[PDB]
């Protein structure tokens, strides 16, 4: 897709066959490379924001969702996403990929078949 292209080009190192193998193939290693991937395609598709963190609501409907977010998937990920202290974290890239940690079980239940956590 369209992003995922751009990203691996706006990301020194990611325009790697080996490594967009696993991205198409939805599968996120941690290193560094992906980690600045993972925030490139976040921030891209609007998933995400340095400052702000995580929509929440734009990654419910990026998991095949058109309606207003569970209260508890709010919930649970706003829980997720403060105890990772991710304004602590200097490294943007690895802040990001920690974010998305988080939500990773949600993609995987997804990929098997706005609400902002950091106002
Ligand atoms: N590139
Ligand atoms: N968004
Ligand atoms: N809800
Ligand atoms: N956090």
């Known amino acids: 897709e369209s992003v995922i292209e751009s990203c691996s080009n706006a990301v020194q190192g990611a325009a790697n066959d080996e490594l967009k193998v696993h991205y198409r193939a939805n599968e996120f290693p941690d290193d560094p490379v992906t980690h600045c991937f993972v925030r490139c395609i976040g921030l891209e598709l609007n998933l995400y924001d340095d400052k702000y963190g995580v929509?929440?609501?734009?990654?419910?409907?990026?998991?095949?969702?058109?309606?207003?977010?569970?209260?508890?998937?709010?919930?649970?990920?706003?829980?997720?996403?403060?105890?990772?202290?991710?304004?602590?974290?200097?490294?943007?890239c690895e802040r990001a990929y920690s974010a998305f940690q988080c939500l990773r079980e949600d993609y995987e239940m997804y990929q098997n078949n706005e609400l902002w956590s950091h106002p």
């Not at 734009?58 to 508890?72: I, K, M, T, V």
């Open 55 to 92: 929509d929440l609501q734009a990654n419910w409907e990026n998991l095949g969702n058109s309606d207003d977010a569970d209260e508890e998937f709010v919930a649970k990920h706003r829980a997720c996403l403060e105890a990772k202290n991710l304004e602590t974290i200097e490294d943007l």
